[PDB]
Nucleic acid binder design. Structure first.
Lengths: 526, 490, 306
DNA sequence: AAGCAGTAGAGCATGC
DNA sequence: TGCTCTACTGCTTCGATATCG
DNA sequence: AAGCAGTAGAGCA
DNA sequence: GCATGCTCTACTGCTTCGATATCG
């Protein structure tokens, strides 16, 4: 439906804190706010972004009570994102640094939201604060604002510098603080925002706070925004009559960019000056150009062309007799293995809704499929159009959801087997043990997953799943560059992109010496 | 070789009692052989449509051959499977075909000896190509055809030895004169029954082999290795729909242009630019600009860490999975580094993590390399080759969000019933044979135009459930599993 | 219109045929310009846009035969269809920058197609650039003089003419508005004096001193009118000393005598009071050239008689 | 990618 | 205002079209 | 290119 | 003295065709 995000940006004096020589937090917060608003203006979402800018010299409010709501300035309210906000974020080289407090921006944002909402409702309310935690505090209104946020449902997400408690770039999935950043103002602000966040929502109050290291390189800003899916109703059968009313939804799939490149003509800047044609010109000689009404869709057979184009094939095609989510057979032996899955999507088949006797029956079915490695072969069709398909229904036993996941399977035209030579009993290409230990030193210096934290559960370095997509990011920043400065040539790529896609540092430094070992012992490469 | 082609000569023994009904009113072996030959052609005209297929009847009354012998009649020559060849050949079906072959060539004579194998050798020698398979399909039923003259037996085994020398091999597909395989005779001197391969089993396949990319994996910056990235599960589909003129029955050869700039005229690649609109403001760019804004790296694989095989859930996949193998265009020894890396990654169950840029300008993509050790057996059950395998990994807007906030518990009165049900339905999986209904009926429907026999032919689809054989096999516990704890009760 | 439409289509033509289409579109522009008062306008864009997209593109590294084709199309079209820096001073600078990019000294290559075509196009058509030929001249002569030592059996002879017409068309303009240039004049004159006195180790700076001396003997006569008289005396001594004192028996330098005669003749047409002791050496010179006819090459045998 | 085909051009022997 | 034919509408499935190793 | 099931505009009562 | 005649192999491109991204 409609979404609403309110961005609080500190402009306070210690937010106008200096730089040691590595990176600067005011620039970091500028990069994160412009990342969010370029996504919102380039995805055409029906939503509103607002700014609450606190720390400027000026005071702009309907009510500014003494020292509270001082250094409160507004520039753009809840509106659809546009290039005006990018102008506001690019024409803000000045801090104008003075701060009264940072605990007034929240209540004035809630007030202007509630006194401006009429006729145009929302299905989420998310406010993100960007502060480096050094200015003063005031706990005049604590429980009344906790109950006001608990009875108005204003969820909030908090952003902090890279100091939590060799050359740190932006964040390379390593240690966040260089050495030290904790003071008493950091302490008091951290505990008051912690206690308002737990007294609003619970345990995530200790976990929905994010640094500028891991907010650029992760989609934690992109939570409680997106709309879920389209509810899929179907019906599962076993045998004669096990007609379970079922809901299906999609899951991980290939992402495609929606905008297209409209071809225009130069020196006019209008579209209508293109009228493309094609002629179905049987020349084979001096040229004869024919009209449409001549075309038989001929196929190839053996060594020739055979006629009969379409209404006859539209009659004598395969009749598809309706959609189906039927069950063909079963197998206790889990012999559908990983290298045969072969589809371009995965389908979470969930449960029933609405008098869920069918859903408790399905949970009984997967709670029977759980105990042994028993697989289920399920035949799918979307509609009359789609070809029918076989697939496997994996069970999924998780914490707050018990689901089944549908993957496709090959038909026996889509395989091919071909003999490749063996490498175990190969009398020519067997290695040496010092070569083997060079490989093992390279592995154990380049390993990323080890167990720690005294309970020996696994911690992994560089989890290659949480990365945002770089392609639409690069494309969208290049378009905003070109539509901002309308003659400059294109940049090279940003450096926080490679600061996102880098492997961490200590693993490279550990591998530096076995990489020298493999280079120095293994034989020549061309 | 890659552009190699194979070859097959059908040598038919229609001489003495094979043209008779064997005094049996059950089956006729001439019509059986012509049905098997029609099945072979009618499969390989869409399966493997480039080999060489010839048809030769011997023991006939007339003769037709380029050395000009007697009793030997070649019919067609080594070429593609053709609709003309099968529409010509199916005039010898049944007793009407028996009489038509009688009047067209006749039947019965003192048949040949070595000379028919001489005709086969002079049929293979003419072809200027690269023959890779040299097989002869013999359709005969007698098993001592020269059992009164030993000079012809010695000359026939001599000439068959000299055909075995140059690389010709014959497999006589035995007709059923005694029905069962009771002719345990002494025909071991020439050779190197079951007909079901020639009968049914291959109505929709293909044959091909390429490599799809030859890229290089770089470990640090200087240690490079060369891998061919094969594809092994490929999603075949129906061929492209050729366009055709109505009257002269020829392709159309379309052409395409662009004009009408509020003046008319005609345009070029340079006059026009690319563009986009975003709400109110419009961007314009060049074709090189919109092709260069997606430009990251160079083609190849880049080693970016290591991980053991425990974090990746098979909930997570995106596309099909390729297969990387140690090729031979960097150095003699990249195989050896891959063999050492294979052994260590398998025994410490570790899997590589890489970035992968497929060709000259594509954004990069994270893959995970999982090893695979081969499996063969006594009788060479070469089911796996040894080498590494890609798995793709999602990024950000792949994983969507469900409604997902639903969690209700059931009762454990159903688990034993369902265990009995799934043990009732248990079948050991498959190895092959789950063929495609849409492509299959398209094959049959295209048979029924250039072969135009009657109608759309047989169209069984081995992907339907059989509820009639499911109900009796399950039994009458459907009602008790439907209403043991839970009534719908409207 | 047939061959012009056949490059206004979608993809085909593997560039050793698009080479020939670009060559035919220009050669047709050379012969018989009765019809293309109109259509030869857009053929300029059809050459320039393609040569732009082959020249400047960071990705898709450039194509080699289509450069040769498009340049030779322009070096056939530019006769009878000029666009010079007098009446249309934009495309002139455009094609000048394009040929200047086309003649940069690549070294690690063989591929002598774009050097040869750009040099020939500048050679025949040097006269079209009337304000942008006079401002890069040290870089111009350095790259051209680099390519006059290029060691190619057909490209040294194809570059020498480019150097020739460059000198010829800079001379006519430095003489034109005299005494307020007054520095370019002095620069070429103080690079030309004594560069014929060079005790050289080749044959080429020799010849180019000869040629520029005999050509720039002209513009000293509007200003000085006494260095022109020191000229030809310096010149006939520095040429008589080359062969009529020594080793007319043993030498192989008969190949610069047409440059000799054209130089001495072009200063001698501007001279006055020929000193009457050197003409008995001029008359051994030109009869040595009348004798030295059959050890020549065709093509050279016509400018010799010139 | 898979294969073929040409040939440009630098390297073997004798000429006004 | 209470009910339903119907007039969209974003939203997905597929089928044909250059692009390229 | 070609359906497709929620979302409403307004006929019918 | 360089002006000519003669010869074998690596650089460029051709053509089919299978795959892949992309448009409708």
């Amino acid at each position: 439906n409609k979404a609403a995000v309110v961005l609080c940006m500190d402009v306070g004096f210690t937010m106008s804190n200096s730089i040691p020589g590595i990176e600067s937090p005011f620039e970091q917060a500028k990069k994160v706010i412009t990342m969010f608003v370029q996504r919102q203006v380039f995805a055409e979402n029906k939503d509103e972004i607002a700014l609450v800018l606190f720390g400027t010299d000026g005071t702009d409010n309907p009510l500014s009570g003494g020292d509270q709501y001082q250094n409160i300035t507004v520039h753009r309210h809840l509106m659809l994102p546009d290039f005006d906000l990018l102008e506001d974020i690019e024409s803000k080289i000045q801090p104008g640094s003075q701060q009264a407090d940072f605990l007034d921006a929240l209540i004035v944002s809630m007030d202007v939201i509630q006194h401006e909402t009429i006729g145009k409702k929302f299905e989420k309310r998310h406010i993100e604060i960007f502060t480096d935690l050094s200015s003063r505090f005031s706990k005049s209104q604590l429980d009344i604002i906790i109950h006001s946020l608990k009875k108005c449902d204003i969820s909030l997400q908090f952003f902090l510098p890279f100091s939590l408690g060799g050359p740190f770039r932006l964040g390379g999935h390593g240690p966040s603080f260089p050495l030290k950043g904790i003071t008493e103002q950091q302490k008091e602000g951290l505990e008051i925002v912690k206690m308002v966040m737990i007294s609003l929502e619970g345990e995530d109050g200790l976990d929905e706070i994010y640094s500028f290291s891991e907010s650029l390189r992760k989609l934690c800003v992109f939570k409680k925004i997106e709309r879920h899916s389209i509810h899929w109703p179907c019906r599962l059968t076993i045998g004669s009559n096990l007609s379970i009313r079922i809901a299906a939804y999609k899951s991980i799939l290939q992402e495609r960019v929606k905008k297209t490149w409209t071809v225009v003509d130069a020196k006019t800047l209008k579209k209508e000056d293109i009228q493309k044609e094609t002629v179905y010109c049987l020349n084979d000689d001096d040229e004869t150009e024919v009209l449409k009404e001549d075309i038989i869709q001929g196929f190839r057979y053996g060594s020739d062309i055979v006629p009969f184009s379409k209404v006859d094939e539209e009659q004598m095609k395969y009749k598809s007799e309706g959609k189906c989510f039927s069950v063909l057979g079963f197998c206790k032996s889990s012999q559908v293995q990983r290298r045969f899955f072969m589809g371009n999507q995965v389908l979470k088949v969930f449960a029933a809704r609405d008098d869920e006797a069918a859903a408790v029956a399905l949970s009984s079915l997967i709670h029977a499929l759980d105990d042994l490695d028993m697989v289920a072969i399920v035949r799918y069709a979307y509609d009359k159009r789609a070809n029918p398909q076989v697939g496997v229904a994996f069970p999924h036993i998780k914490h707050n959801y018990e689901c089944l996941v549908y993957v496709q399977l090959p038909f026996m035209e889509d395989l091919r087997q071909y003999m490749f030579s063996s490498l175990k009993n190969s009398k020519k290409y067997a290695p040496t043990e010092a070569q083997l230990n060079a490989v093992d030193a390279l592995i154990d210096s380049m390993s990323l997953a080890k167990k720690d934290e005294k309970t020996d559960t696994l911690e992994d370095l560089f989890p290659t799943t949480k990365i945002p997509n770089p392609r639409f990011q690069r494309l969208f920043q290049c378009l905003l560059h070109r539509a901002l400065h309308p003659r400059e040539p294109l940049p090279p790529i940003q450096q926080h992109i490679w600061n996102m896609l880098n492997p961490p540092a200590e693993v490279t430094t550990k591998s530096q010496i076995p990489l020298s070992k493999i280079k120095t012992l293994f034989p020549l490469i061309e | 070789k890659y552009s190699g082609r194979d070859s097959l000569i059908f040598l038919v023994d229609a001489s003495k009692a094979m043209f008779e009904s064997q005094s049996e009113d059950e089956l006729t072996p001439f019509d059986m052989s012509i049905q098997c030959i029609q099945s072979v052609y009618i499969s390989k005209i869409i399966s493997s449509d480039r080999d060489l297929l010839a048809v030769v009847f011997y023991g006939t009354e007339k003769d037709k051959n380029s050395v000009n012998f007697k009793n030997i009649y070649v019919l067609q020559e080594l070429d593609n499977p053709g609709a003309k060849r099968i529409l010509e050949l199916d005039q010898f079906k049944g007793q009407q075909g028996q009489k038509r072959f009688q009047d067209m060539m006749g039947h019965g004579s003192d048949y040949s000896l070595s000379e028919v194998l001489w005709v086969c050798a002079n049929l293979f020698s003419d072809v200027q190509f690269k023959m890779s398979h040299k097989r002869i399909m013999l359709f005969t039923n007698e098993d001592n055809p020269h059992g009164n003259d030993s000079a012809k037996a010695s000359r026939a085994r001599t000439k068959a030895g000299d055909l075995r020398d140059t690389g010709i091999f014959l497999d006589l597909m035995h007709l059923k004169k005694p029905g069962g395989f009771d002719i345990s005779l002494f025909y071991r001197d020439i050779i190197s029954s079951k007909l079901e391969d020639l009968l049914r089993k291959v109505r929709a396949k293909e044959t091909r082999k390429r490599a799809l990319s030859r890229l290089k994996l770089k470990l640090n910056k200087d240690i490079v290795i060369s891998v061919g990235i094969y594809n092994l599960v490929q999603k075949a589909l129906k061929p492209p729909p050729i366009k055709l003129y109505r009257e002269t029955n020829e392709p159309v050869k379309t052409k395409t242009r662009t004009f009408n700039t509020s003046t008319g005229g005609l345009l070029l690649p340079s006059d026009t630019k690319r563009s986009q609109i975003y709400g109110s403001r419009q961007i314009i760019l060049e074709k090189e600009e919109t092709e260069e804004l997606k430009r990251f790296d160079d083609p190849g694989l880049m080693l970016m860490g290591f991980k053991p095989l425990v974090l990746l859930k098979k909930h997570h996949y995106l596309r099909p999975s390729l297969f990387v193998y140690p090729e031979e265009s960097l150095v003699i020894g990249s195989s050896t580094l891959f063999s050492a890396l294979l052994i260590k990654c398998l025994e410490k169950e570790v899997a590589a993590l890489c970035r992968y840029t497929p060709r000259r300008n594509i954004p990069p993509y994270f893959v995970a390399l999982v090893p695979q050790e081969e499996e063969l057996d006594d009788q060479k059950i070469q089911v796996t080759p040894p080498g590494f395998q890609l798995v793709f990994l999602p990024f950000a807007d792949d994983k969507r969000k469900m409604p997902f906030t639903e969690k209700i518990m059931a009762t454990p009165e159903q688990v034993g019933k369902m265990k009995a049900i799934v043990e009732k339905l248990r079948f050991t999986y498959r190895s092959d044979s789950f063929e495609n209904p849409v492509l299959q009926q398209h094959f049959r429907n295209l048979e029924a135009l250039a072969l135009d026999l009657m109608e759309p032919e047989q169209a069984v689809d081995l992907t339907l459930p059989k509820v009639e054989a499911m109900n009796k096999r399950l039994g009458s516990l459907v009602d008790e599993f439907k209403e043991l704890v839970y009534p719908p009760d409207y | 219109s047939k061959f012009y439409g056949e490059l206004a289509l979608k993809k085909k033509i593997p560039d050793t045929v698009l080479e020939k289409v670009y060559e035919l579109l220009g050669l047709l522009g050379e012969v018989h310009p009765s019809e293309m008062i109109n259509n030869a306008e857009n053929l300029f864009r059809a050459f320039l846009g393609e040569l732009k997209t082959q020249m400047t593109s960071a990705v898709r590294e450039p194509k080699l035969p289509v450069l040769a084709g498009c340049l030779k199309g322009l070096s056939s079209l530019l006769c009878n269809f000029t666009k010079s820096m007098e009446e249309d001073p934009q495309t002139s600078r455009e094609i000048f920058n394009f040929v200047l990019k086309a003649i940069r000294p690549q070294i690690d290559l063989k591929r002598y197609a774009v050097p040869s075509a750009g040099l020939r196009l500048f050679a025949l058509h040097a006269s079209q650039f009337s304000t942008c030929l006079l401002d890069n001249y040290v870089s111009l002569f350095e790259v051209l003089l680099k390519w006059c030592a290029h060691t190619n059996v057909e490209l040294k002879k194809a570059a020498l003419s480019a150097l020739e017409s460059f000198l010829k068309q800079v001379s006519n303009m430095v003489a034109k508005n005299a005494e307020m240039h007054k520095n370019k004049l002095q620069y070429f004159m103080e690079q030309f004096y004594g560069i014929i006195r060079n005790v050289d180790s080749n044959n080429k700076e020799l010849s180019i001193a000869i040629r520029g001396y005999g050509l720039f003997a002209g513009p000293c006569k509007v200003i000085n009118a006494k260095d022109v008289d020191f000229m030809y005396v310096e010149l006939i001594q520095r040429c008589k000393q080359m062969f009529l004192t020594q080793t007319d028996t043993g030498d192989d330098r008969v190949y610069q005598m047409p440059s000799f005669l054209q130089s001495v003749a072009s200063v001698l047409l501007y001279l006055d009071t020929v000193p009457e002791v050197y003409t008995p050496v001029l008359e051994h010179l030109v009869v040595m050239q009348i004798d030295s006819f059959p050890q020549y090459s065709p093509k050279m045998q016509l400018v010799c008689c010139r």
